[PDB]
Design a protein around this ligand. Structure first.
Ligand SMILES: Nc1ncnc2c1ncn2[C@@H]1O[C@H](COP(=O)(O)O)[C@@H](O)[C@H]1O
Ligand SMILES: Nc1ncnc2c1ncn2[C@@H]1O[C@H](COP(=O)(O)O)[C@@H](O)[C@H]1O
Ligand SMILES: [Mg+2]
Lengths: 456, 576, 576, 99
RNA sequence: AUUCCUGUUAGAGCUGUUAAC
DNA sequence: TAACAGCTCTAACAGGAATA
RNA sequence: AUUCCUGUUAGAGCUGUUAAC
DNA sequence: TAACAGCTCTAACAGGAATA
């Protein structure tokens, strides 16, 4: 009775890179081959701009210089790869801004920060951008710096400065790479350089890497929510992200609102149907009208009867729907035996119940070790000694745990904002949660949809 | 009239209810509306003369919609969503070619884009299970026909303008259910959709509606007036003896946005003696969902198709353990049936009241409410006097897993019982944090031989480790090894969850040792965690995890005793 | 044309195939045929004027039929099953009242007596899965309208004479599937069933038959001819260019009883250059059953409704063993997976050939064909030389129960293996009678201590019994106690069946001791049989039937060894 | 088993043209007639009960420049009840581009 | 906020099970 | 609607860095 | 054949699994 | 279509009588 169903370890998903080469290590492949989207010239050159107070601009130009020159990894050398220099590794020059492409924040921002007013501080930071907006064509990415003296307005109740800035500059189409003092004072340098460089390339152009072995006929959907603590009650702001590989070479990753008020994170019949309608209409527009054949709707909470009925009735019979729920905190945890020195291989899925499975999005990864090749690497070794798996509670499917598990595993590796090897959750869930935070901070965003490069 | 009272009225008399659904239900069936048809026609018209690529620019874009509407207004056409526009654009595009008009209207509303939702399926179920007999519609596409064919499995008799008089006879001979389209199927020559055709009514269909008025009461949904012929037919139906035996219930998604024609017709009907009421019940789909919810004794065969989510999908079986194998922390509890004690109270009791009685009396027994008690009767007599106790009997839990899954009170009770059993005869202390239970090595008895293996588990490079002590930089915080033990219901099985933790003697001062808890747990890798879990299994069970079926009973010296049996080996499964 | 060649031709090209079902197919749907309708009309007519009780005398009685027909002949009416009779009796009973005639024809052919059989369901599946697009019918009842609604779950577009031009438009715009009734639904006013109405054809429908003639080839079933209008429409369809691209396949249940009109039409069609063929395929139901059988890649969703017997019903679960308990003779074999040896032969081998090789060589191993061998490789080398052996490898039987259930060779092989294992290390002799294996106490070693308990089992009033010996009145027959041991596959489990028997040393001379076998077994009542079964369990297993899991391996000293484990306690279940 | 591209080279196409005329309508471009074989081919295709159900469309760059036989055939088809039409468009390639 | 998710402290949201109103 | 049980989530902080 | 079904001796019928034809 | 495996049945006989 102690013998469970046999598991199968899904191998490490391959990532499409420069010249359609595949390598499961993102940074190693980027150094070796280059970005997938560099095959075409979406970014001609990464022209930057600075927005910071006059005192701390030297930090911005210093960090840009550090991006220009190669760096070596000091911490987590088990996984990271030596930086080859932005021009060498992304095959595109990184242009330092000239005098007019380099703005100065108003001194009134300091007064507002001393006053402890987050809303007015974000408004003033945005209003400082007019000098660059007269030259919006000149630059591609704006590096907004915030001095530590503004910490009092960085994060407090009912507010978040980063989300407010992102929601204020998203309709203005300019990507923004916010830099705090943390990126400056992080012990290691190759960490910050790799993260900032991949973010800069994604926000100026896009697609640093693309997941291979992706059927063009599947659209993956992830719903996630956030809470705004009202004085009387609460507001549950839920938003949905969508990923798919279209007929064109440009892999698409978008997010959107879901509309009024919600008291619970469970969508009703009409709201679920409307969101799903918007989703497959977006897919059809990106697929010249072709119907999706596989749909994956990942939700952090269980689908009610209304949500499943809305899913069933929104599509036609030809498009099978894979309604799956992702559980983050679970009691179970495993230990590999042959007992192994390193924890269980990443990607092992263990069918517990006919509808509930354990997926090991965390765990040892093979073939991505730089030093002592052949040794396994545990991404979260610093944080945890063992990997905590997630629970997939399939609410609607025809058959095959492998089909959804491999899709989730491949969706855990295409977060360009993530410096590390993978993510505990699929990019759909994480982007839906990020956009949920953004919408909760700024409710007047429900009108439009946005690409990933805006909010990553 | 409030919506809930309307629902109660409809449920009270649902056997005599005509439905009237014109162009409002089709919005939610996946097929284009009137405005969508108008915009599609404008798109074709603009792309045709002004030579522009049809697929290059879409139709639901705001810019393209504005440009096409500006072009239409340039040639003097009607301005915006105004009467005599839909028919105008039809007669403009198709220049009086009713065959081509019919073919286009068939293609736009064809039976391939339609995906039945809950509303049409629920109405078709009402038709089949024979509550509503007549469903009049001003709508062309076969949404209700497809829903009835999908649910009932029987062919539905649709009536139209070709035959025309066919419906009246069916009414007279009670050939229910009848689904008479006042404007007929698009599969036939006459469609009656343009404004000039919308001023007249077919004589036989008019007579059929007038006759059906006396027999049933009407519920009209997804209809916003704007049609003169249907409005005058309804007005004529009102102007006759006992026009509606069950009242005309006009439902709109929003009372505020309802056209004044509907309101004045309702006032006229009320002035003519009928009890016609206008209610708002939200969308048609939600209305029909609620109506089906209030339906009693719905057949299972049709309800398996009405609500496909109600049946449980994805019952995908799991394979065998054939052919590296992860070793989880789950100990399977193979106990299937247990015995408990029940006390009957002369007055109703609350689970909170029993919890506070537990807190005050502190008996040597367990109790929960559902009052099921595990232990000795005299303890319950201490808790409850003879006056409040009526009788004390026995309870049998034939299926433990189903019982704990059904009621969370049973889950908590069985978890507490198994925890008490596991720590009944052992020196390991039993504490609780939040709603979880912790078995922690005691401070005084830390030098026991049964802990020595645990001492080996935490040891560095094979030397002797430490099990209990004081934090390196804390004033009074004391720390020990511990295991969080929980009950997990998985499918049809129960398992015991063990997780190694670092217990802190002060409950509220755990965070001050966080770094220490981190520092002690930095290097508890797979081998070390395997060793600690094996040591904890040995401590909690007394037998190594090979082929063991150790059985533990709680309160063995009590009349009501629970005897569980948990396999000493944690869950494992070799890879395929 | 032979029926099989017709099936291959249809199967070869079923994509483009109109069907022309007549009133013969509805014969099975349970609807009254033409003759049944005539006899019903005669019954009403006779009972009406001659005042006789309607329900007192039935209609399918031979005497009442003869009496009514004699009465009809008395008034000069047509004699017997002759033309212009069906219409004659209709026009006589209903005296030119087409509304009442329609109502009666609706009531007789109503949609409550119809129970769809395999033929209509298979045709509706062909319609939905889109092989046949046009199904013409001269038949009124919705025998096929209902089947499509039940199978597809979608509304079917039925065409009739009320519109009658819908078919040509739907054909022209490829709105398949179309089901055009050449004589229209009975719901509508025009039915076109009397002989005067059967001389003319609707212009638009007639037009459709010719346009559809060019597109597809026709298969007409359940049509006997006798209709002038349909015959002349078919003849006109023949007299046009490439009249049938796939030939007119006229099918009759019997070629001998086919009317000469069909044969002369076939000859005329052949003379007009088309490949029309007349075949006999039995009844319509059998024809469509075979056609569906030859259909490839039929969707599971619709096939679950086409053949409801194909899905497995009555999967009624069994309850728990909760709460007198019968003790059967079944020992559960909990072994799930075993290992076997496979030899690859350079030339094909027959199971009979392997059996005779076993008989000649007599090796110390087991073999079966599927060649799976259990034992030592050198034994197989003795059986098969190196020249005929290509390779020797391993085989794993992950699911033993499913494997034995699927292949009876596996059942016999596993039964022989478990029998050899059980008698490997024990003195009890192993024999076979028919195909049943017997474990019998040996003659010489009958005084063993392990048999003493068995000696107690057969003893009378608790004394010492006898286990082996000679018959009371037989010249040379010797008798012994024995147990027939068999393998039984029950559901998803395997069990060992033990039955106490009286083995006779001469195989063919068992009957001469029958009385003795009876006499020894006269008083082997429940207690005595319980004792003998317990003693045999102890002998065969070495452990008493309490909480035991004895494991036995066959050929333990061999590379390929099978290790089974059978619970020592027989099956039991307490009453509910 | 569509699509097919059959060249008249003007009886093996006669039956094919007849069946095709039964099936779906025809549009003819780049042809002025002037050939009696195809003329009788099309005239024989017209007679059947459902011939060119969608319609026959003789498209020429200029209506007045077309040969009289084409207009005669169009009038004959219209009299027979078929929905044949003579529409004036541009060059065949320009017509197909606009389509 | 270059990143990652490990914990702490809280509240909700769903399910339920009773008592009602 | 008021408690109570469990399962799971986010909301604020804090926080150190890949088997030693 | 007042009954009952316990055995003996045989053959078929279905399923299969191979080899074909 | 020819064997082979099991599961189950009937077709002819024979045959003795309800825990002793
Ligand atoms: N989901 C719905 N449920 C009920 N009624 C609806 C729905 N959607 C639209 N309607 C009504 O249908 C009307 C439009 O029908 P018409 O414009 O006459 O074709 C609107 O005025 C709405 O009141
Ligand atoms: N199994 C069958 N299915 C359909 N039609 C049949 C069947 N057996 C016979 N028929 C035909 O049914 C016809 C009788 O129709 P009717 O002339 O209306 O009585 C005869 O011509 C038979 O050939
Ligand atoms: Mg960023």
């Amino acid at each position: 009775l102690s013998q469970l169903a046999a598991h199968s370890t899904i191998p490490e998903p391959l990532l499409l890179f420069k010249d359609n080469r595949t390598d499961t290590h993102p940074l190693r492949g980027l150094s070796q081959y280059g970005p997938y989207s560099a095959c075409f010239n979406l970014p001609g050159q990464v022209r930057l701009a600075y927005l910071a107070p006059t005192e701390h601009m030297r930090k911005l130009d210093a960090i840009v210089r550090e991006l220009q020159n190669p760096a070596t990894p000091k911490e987590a050398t088990n996984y990271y790869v030596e930086y080859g220099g932005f021009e060498k590794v992304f095959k595109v020059p990184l242009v330092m801004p000239q005098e007019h492409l380099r703005c100065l924040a108003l001194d009134e921002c300091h007064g507002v920060a001393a006053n402890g007013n987050g809303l007015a501080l974000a408004d003033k930071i945005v209003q400082s951008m007019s000098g660059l907006f007269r030259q919006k064509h000149a630059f591609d990415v704006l590096l907004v710096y915030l001095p530590a003296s503004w910490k009092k307005c960085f994060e407090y109740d009912g507010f978040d400065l980063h989300d407010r800035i992102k929601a204020k500059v998203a309709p203005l189409n300019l990507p923004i790479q916010i830099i705090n003092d943390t990126a400056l004072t992080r012990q290691c340098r190759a960490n910050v350089m790799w993260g900032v460089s991949v973010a800069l390339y994604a926000k100026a152009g896009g697609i640093p890497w693309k997941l291979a072995d992706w059927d063009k006929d599947e659209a993956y959907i992830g719903l996630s929510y956030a809470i705004k603590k009202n004085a009387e009650g609460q507001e549950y702001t839920t938003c949905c992200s969508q990923v798919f590989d279209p007929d064109g070479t440009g892999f698409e990753f978008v997010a959107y609102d879901t509309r009024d008020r919600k008291g619970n994170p469970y969508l009703s019949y009409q709201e679920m149907q409307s969101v799903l309608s918007k989703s497959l209409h977006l897919y059809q527009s990106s697929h010249n009208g072709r119907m999706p054949r596989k749909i994956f709707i990942h939700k952090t909470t269980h689908f009610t009867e209304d949500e499943i009925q809305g899913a069933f009735d929104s599509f036609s019979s030809s498009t099978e729907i894979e309604l799956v729920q992702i559980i983050q905190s679970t009691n179970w945890y495993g230990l590999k035996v042959d007992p192994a020195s390193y924890p269980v291989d990443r990607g092992l899925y263990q069918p517990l119940t006919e509808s509930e499975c354990l997926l090991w999005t965390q765990g040892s990864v093979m073939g991505v070790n730089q030093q002592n090749p052949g040794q396994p690497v545990f991404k979260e070794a610093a944080l945890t000694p063992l990997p905590n798996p997630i629970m997939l509670r399939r609410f609607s499917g025809n058959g095959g745990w492998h089909a959804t598990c491999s899709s989730i595993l491949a969706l855990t590796k295409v977060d360009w904002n993530n410096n590390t090897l993978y993510k505990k959750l699929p990019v759909t869930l994480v982007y839906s949660q990020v956009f949920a935070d953004v919408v909760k901070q700024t409710p007047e965003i429900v009108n439009e949809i946005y690409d990933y490069r805006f909010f990553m | 009239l409030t919506d809930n009272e309307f629902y109660q009225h409809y449920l009270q008399n649902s056997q005599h209810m005509m439905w009237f659904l014109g162009a409002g239900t089709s919005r939610s069936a996946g097929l284009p509306t009137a405005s969508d048809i108008i915009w599609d026609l404008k798109h074709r018209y603009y792309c045709l003369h002004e030579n522009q690529d049809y697929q290059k620019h879409d139709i639901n874009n705001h810019a393209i919609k504005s440009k096409i509407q500006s072009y239409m207004d340039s040639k003097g056409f009607p301005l915006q969503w105004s009467p005599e526009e839909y028919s105008f654009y039809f007669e403009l595009v198709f220049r009086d070619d009713y065959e081509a008009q019919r073919k286009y209207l068939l293609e736009a509303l064809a039976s391939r884009k339609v995906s039945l939702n809950i509303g049409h399926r629920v109405l078709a179920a009402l038709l089949e299970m024979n509550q509503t007999k007549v469903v009049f519609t001003t709508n062309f596409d076969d949404v209700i026909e497809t829903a009835f064919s999908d649910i009932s499995g029987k062919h539905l008799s649709v009536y139209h303008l070709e035959g025309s008089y066919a419906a009246l006879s069916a009414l007279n001979t009670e050939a229910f259910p009848i689904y008479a389209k006042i404007h007929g199927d698009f599969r036939y020559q006459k469609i009656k959709n343009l404004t000039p055709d919308l001023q007249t009514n077919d004589r036989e269909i008019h007579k059929c509606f007038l006759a059906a008025a006396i027999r049933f009461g009407l519920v009209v949904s997804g209809y916003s007036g704007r049609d003169e012929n249907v409005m005058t037919m309804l007005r004529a139906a009102i102007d006759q003896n006992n026009a509606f035996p069950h009242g005309l219930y006009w439902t709109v998604p929003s009372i505020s946005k309802s056209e004044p024609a509907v309101q004045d017709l309702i006032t006229y009907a009320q002035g003519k003696g009928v009890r016609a009421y206008l209610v708002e019940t939200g969308t048609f789909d939600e209305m029909l969902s609620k109506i089906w919810r209030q339906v009693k004794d719905k057949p299972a065969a049709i309800d398996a198709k009405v609500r496909t989510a109600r049946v449980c999908p994805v019952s995908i079986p799991l394979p065998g353990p054939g052919k590296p194998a992860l070793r989880t922390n789950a100990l399977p509890v193979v106990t299937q049936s247990i015995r408990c004690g029940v006390v009957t109270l002369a007055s109703p009791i609350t689970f909170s009241e029993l919890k506070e009685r537990i807190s005050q009396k502190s008996p040597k027994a367990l109790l929960t409410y559902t009052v099921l008690f595990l232990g000795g009767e005299p303890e319950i007599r201490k808790i409850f006097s003879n006056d409040e106790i009526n009788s004390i009997g026995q309870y049998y839990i034939d299926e433990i897993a189903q019982s704990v899954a059904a009621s969370t009170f049973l889950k908590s009770f069985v978890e507490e019982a198994i925890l008490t059993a596991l720590l009944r005869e052992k020196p390991i202390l039993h504490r609780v944090r939040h709603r979880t239970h912790y078995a922690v090595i005691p401070n005084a008895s830390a030098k026991d031989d049964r802990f020595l293996d645990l001492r080996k588990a935490v040891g560095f490079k094979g030397d002797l480790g430490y099990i209990t002590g004081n934090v390196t930089n804390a004033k009074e915080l004391s720390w020990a090894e511990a295991v969080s033990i929980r009950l997990e219901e998985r499918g049809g099985k129960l398992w015991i969850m063990l997780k190694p933790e670092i217990w802190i003697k002060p409950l509220d001062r755990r965070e001050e040792a966080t770094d220490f808890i981190r520092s002690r747990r930095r290097y508890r890798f797979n081998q070390c965690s395997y060793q600690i879990l094996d040591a904890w299994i040995k401590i909690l069970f007394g037998s190594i995890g090979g082929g063991g079926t150790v059985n533990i009973s709680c309160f063995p010296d009590a009349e009501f005793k629970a005897e569980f049996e948990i396999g000493t080996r944690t869950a494992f499964s070799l890879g395929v």
